[PDB]
Chain length 468, copies 4
């Protein structure tokens, strides 16, 4: 078992320690080859064929790059080879919980199929990591390379999902606090997962990446902030950090929240819902699970991938007919039709647990002029989109710490005022898109009148008339 070299188009030739190779070469990790990073966005950007697997390799690589760079510049942090391997493992494994079509699964499908459950891809990642470790004999291999599984499994999970409920972490003590800001940074959102997907998604989408993670790594240092060691950026680089969140927002606008990519995601979700009683996934002890229950057994979840779409598409069973017909309509490009768009006024946000009530509100609106067609709640889709800098209404740069060239061990803060008067004054907004499943010209005309009336009833922004 020696170092393996892998050639990635984004990062070039990456070295994998043999413990990481042992983790990668398992059913639970290889599964990520069959889950598209961008889900339905491939049906809009034909270059966006990339899967979660290759992204995970990239995240693991970058996690290793940052921890190594901090260790080389600051030997006093006493970063050990054990620490480095743990950080790489967490980076590699933080996408293990994603389901079919990535964000479609946790963002659209599970909230509709299992409204009572509180599922996140992060919790899924921890559950899947645990299942990976336990099914493949990884603990004794960890010991063989000097990891202490009791402490180090806890550390890896904590880096993925946060404190597993004073210093709240158990995997490492406070003097290694900075290690928890690499893989998933809950304090300000600056972490290696974004860095990989900015570069990788851009390469495949055909949009150029404008953030330079390498530069950020070169300038990162650890300093003491309120009696905790934290990753700090150079003061001068504050503008690049505002630009990094601007880039994320751009990618959301152009690609991840594309109105057609989103309706494709919605149609796939509607097909899974219609198929859910009939697709069977075998889990532990030969028990049978459904698409919506596979999250309750990691053996079954291991086998839940984008394949489910083609299982439905290629089915012949008449019980799957309605589900299959939705997917067939995607192939013919007979999509549910865009009716229009609005925004809430102020800092008003429609919360997730109101999502399912919105189609009935639109259908119950009492429009402008009398109508020939009457539409019902189930004829409307109402897609609520949050665009923000990753910290709800907050400016994430208020939660970054900086150092100056003349005192590189002294952390400081920088306010927005001190940076630039051309920056945004708000950091979150919401867009509401409405679509109609009835596509004839009379239904669509009526759907538009319901929509515009609803906007007026809710005091939302007056829709642009756009087309018509």
């Amino acid at each position: 078992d020696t170092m393996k070299v892998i050639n990635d188009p984004i990062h070039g030739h990456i070295e994998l320690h043999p413990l990481l190779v042992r983790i990668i070469d398992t059913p639970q990790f290889q599964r990520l080859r069959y889950i598209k990073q961008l889900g339905g966005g491939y049906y809009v950007f034909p270059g966006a064929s990339h899967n979660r697997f290759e992204h995970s390799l990239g995240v693991g690589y970058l996690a290793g790059c940052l921890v190594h760079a901090l260790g080389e510049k600051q030997p006093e942090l006493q970063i050990s080879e054990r620490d480095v391997l743990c950080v790489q493992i967490a980076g590699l494994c933080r996408n293990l919980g994603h389901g079919p079509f990535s964000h479609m699964f946790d963002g659209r499908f599970i909230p509709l199929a299992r409204p009572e459950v509180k599922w996140t891809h992060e919790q899924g990642s921890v559950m899947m990591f645990e299942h990976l470790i336990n099914s493949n004999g990884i603990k004794p291999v960890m010991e063989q390379y000097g990891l202490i599984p009791e402490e180090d499994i806890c550390f890896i999970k904590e880096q993925i999902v946060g404190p597993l409920e004073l210093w709240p972490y158990k995997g490492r003590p406070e003097n290694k606090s900075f290690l928890y800001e690499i893989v998933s940074n809950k304090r300000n959102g600056i972490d290696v997962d974004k860095w990989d997907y900015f570069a990788r998604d851009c390469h495949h989408l055909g949009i150029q990446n404008n953030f330079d993670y390498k530069r950020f790594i070169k300038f990162a240092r650890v300093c003491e902030v309120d009696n905790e060691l934290r990753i700090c950026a150079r003061d001068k680089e504050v503008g690049n950090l505002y630009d990094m969140f601007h880039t994320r927002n751009s990618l959301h606008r152009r690609a991840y929240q594309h109105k057609v990519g989103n309706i494709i995601d919605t149609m796939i979700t509607d097909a899974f819902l219609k198929a859910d009683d009939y697709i069977e996934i075998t889990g532990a002890g030969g028990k049978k699970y459904r698409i919506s229950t596979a999250i309750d057994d990691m053996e079954a979840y291991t086998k839940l991938t984008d394949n489910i779409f083609l299982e439905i598409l290629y089915s012949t069973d008449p019980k799957l007919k309605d589900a299959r017909e939705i997917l067939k309509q995607i192939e013919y490009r007979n999509l549910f039709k865009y009716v229009g768009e609005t925004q809430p006024t102020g800092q008003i946000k429609i919360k997730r647990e109101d999502y399912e009530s919105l189609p009935k509100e639109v259908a119950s609106a009492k429009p402008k002029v009398l109508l020939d067609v009457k539409l019902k709640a189930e004829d409307f889709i109402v897609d609520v989109i949050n665009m923000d800098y990753g910290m709800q209404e907050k400016n994430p740069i208020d939660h970054v710490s900086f150092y100056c060239k003349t005192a590189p061990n002294r952390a400081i803060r920088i306010t927005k005022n001190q940076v630039s008067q051309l920056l945004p004054e708000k950091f979150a907004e919401q867009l509401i898109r409405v679509y109609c499943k009835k596509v004839d010209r009379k239904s669509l005309y009526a759907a538009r009148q319901y929509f515009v009336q609803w906007c007026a009833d809710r005091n939302f922004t007056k829709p642009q008339d756009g087309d018509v």
Copy 2:
């Protein structure tokens, strides 16, 4: 309704005429989203996630770029908008016949499952195009945009598969001969399908493309060669054309024939073979097909994609157990082990019908080394790979014609010795790779001794690591020392 613009990572924003959009938006074309361009190469190069779909859009785009450029520089060729659309449709549709994991299917699986049949992805493409046209009402849309379906369907199919039986084509007459050199060029191999996959495979593999197709297009013209209109290159550019085939050969060497990518393809094929008697695919009239017979019914073939690998991998049926276990071993990376590589010396070339005899020959070699373990024929895989410049033994540049700046419509020939002494003297070769299915350290040591002995017995080239893997076998052969 209207023209669509699509953002492709290789070519940027490309325009799709509404007839092309009508062809794209069908189950027969969208199928190509579920077939990986490089098959098992993704299990070696993790960037190589791209599918035949986006390649096909790129081929159609490039076909349109070349035909438009010829028409703009030479209005005297009388290239019509109808011709342009036909050439674009052929470029878009020339990959329709590919099967699961692309070259694995027609290159490895079908030859082993149906040895009596003569299947190519080209014939597949023609059959699938026909099925696409007839199942989706495309003929009246063709008429609406000025095509004459009977004649233009024939032209499109001819551009894909070649003459469908003195001028042998029926789709266009002799004065548009150059149109048959864009999508699939049977005379010299220079066509737009290569240009797309050079750029696209490189972008995703993480290897850089050295050929500039745009430059070639700027310098291409049509001239009369031996009473036929042909696409000719500028004289000066002959070196770039040698380099283009050198690039193709490089991509084969580095990626498409990667020794581990090939063994993964071989293991996937062996899994499909073991699954073939049990997976059912419904086709026309509700008739049932197998993976190996789905090529005989386009309705069934429409539903034969890379999904088959996951159908096998996730199955619970006990009859699929042997097939599923192969794929599981791929996931654990318990792959058949590479033993080594050699080439025939001279002009002898091992023919397909001798492939099955090779594992027995390796196993019957008599290495004079201490061996504990004894291996059998079935413990060895022998993979024979043909590397050439696309025209078997021939130099494809001897089949290109050139023009000079002082007489741009007058075609000439250029010989290899007029270009450079640094160019190849031979244009085809074979590589032979050996692998062992027994993976332990003693089996692999023994497999290496049988291998190197067999090479010496057959007068093949000395393996590159031959002195390290078989130090006691290499001194016997005086040619190697």
Copy 3:
């Protein structure tokens, strides 16, 4: 005298019409090989070795791309081959008036050397174009290719500098109004010069940008707005347009206004000022000009390039000693030292005529700290930088018009609040950087106390490192705590 092909790293293989080749192959155009696009930026970003020449070729190319695209999609605009060539010539020639080190010359040097004169690179380009045309016999070549020089020279100059003198242009009538929005767009700043330098500067600097000009061209059309034909964009593209100006601002912040690039430009300017009495440049009729007067005679200006820096650096004349010493200090990297950066709060714009008073204000600040070393006004440089979206306080997207796909002849406006709440609220600001000419550790410590005190006195923003550089000064200001 047919089409020449040129390989550019940004745009690939570009075609040049023979008239454009005749204009390029003149001393007045080739001069742009010896002027760096980014001036002193090369001394910070070592990839930024590119010259105005190659930028100009790119601008000409893009001007041709946009005008061709509009003419192909909208034949009713009656865009002629003559119009296309005129637009290409204007794009090619709009950088002809640049001086040594590009923006250093018109932005720093000429304002200080000739405070009474009003010089811009645009006026320079018109004067240089006229000199190019008249010295090289271009008018008969223009006629040969169907241009009417009297009208078309006027058109080309107008496209560079704006109306030369109710429809104010004389080169083309109102029905070709949209032609004046390609090369230099004074109405909203969207023109092809930016598109080239975004791509080219990024390629050389080692910074990437996410603006796609090709996409913009696909979605651009000409529509009637308030009885004038204008270039409009598809409604969906509004976000991209905000991003395009965000990218320009980024490039300014990261590269063009780099604090060290600017101090290098300042030191080069100070060297030119010290050399200005002594360098002689021969112009028309053997008359002698200085660096600062060469703008008054295009024959002399033709010979005024970045070479002046090396003429000074390599000189032995004792009268050039002070100038030469400055440049030698640049080579040793003994640069003026950066003290810090602040911004005015509110809508205080510091005006140009107050620039010279700022060093005295910093030096007169009364920091309330033990200061052993004493600094003077002449020890401080104060560089005031205006950053904006190209139309001072205005949002340039308020001056773009957009069309919906289903009504492509109806242009409308889109307001900022209809696009996003996360957009800027202001479109112009100023940065003030302070530097010290005394470079030792004690001088710099003192300079930082003067600086931070001055900021507090003027109610400027708290410098980012303010608490580290001036720990005794920042607590006085309650606004900062």
Copy 4:
């Protein structure tokens, strides 16, 4: 301490403070004013890059390779001192280049100073010595743990080779591998090529297909015939053949472009005409010429591409002939390409025969009605050697490899073990002929002299031979 520089090819590069002290000198900054590709900028408008940025890249890559070897093989005992010395040598190996890079040492000096034997490598050693002594670098070297007597010798040896059994004095035999990084005289594989492949491609608009990072990942040091050498992985042999194929490509497409070369020729002819009259001040106020500035590093420090513009902008009547040549370049009134041929076999025209070739072309007797009659001085004959960096030899015969199963055991690999599609020779010559008389009748006649000369000396048929000289190509049955 460490300075960060953003380079477009390598990204953000760290420079140790000793390297920064070397860079920030007049002797190093000079390289900002010397174009990497000389006259090639007049053909490829992207090729504006200078020797400066290339040098930074070479230093960076030298550091990357030595660090990689030291991290994978701690038993080599590579010290931080060794690393810095290797980086300094990489940074400084281009210091000796002159105006327009290869034009200076390849065309100008051989013609202006035929008695002297000058190379850019010797220039680099002289310039390095001058840089060190004029800028007080020795005490800074000591401050960072270098021993200047030994380490200056090592750096110079890495640039120019052995300065007089193990022939090097800067390091002993157990660090032999250190001398294969910056300039590898045994097989040509070094970091200078790797930088210019990537950088020249970026600026030319041609894409690089060699992956130096991959080579570094697979490089190891093994004992070969009792010497420690840098070896490559056996599998990677194909990539190494491709690396020299890429170099040959870049030469064919760009470095030896027929117009780029004629522009270099015309620039050289201008310098020769200016050489008696341009003065460059050097040490002690002594005056030097363009051709003698190589003898005094203070004057050479001030000899850059500026000399072209000094000539172009001059008014001195003694510079008139030189200035007129350069003005003709601006108007694109260039000497005209007549054609191209190659010697047959392994026949090779030697440098000392170059000047006699125009007389041979002019003395050819074409057998055609010619109104115009041309003389020796109307012809330029440019002889170009294209090879894999070791004359007739295959450079892969001088590479050592290791196998995965015995990474300490070096082996050799022959060409026939790799592929039958590889080149059968590793060197050739191209001969290009140009005419200084540019009218249509002169050029017609020049083509007949040219094609006749080719037939007389059994040379290869010109590619357009049947269109340029339809009445001359029928002589030769090999061509028909």
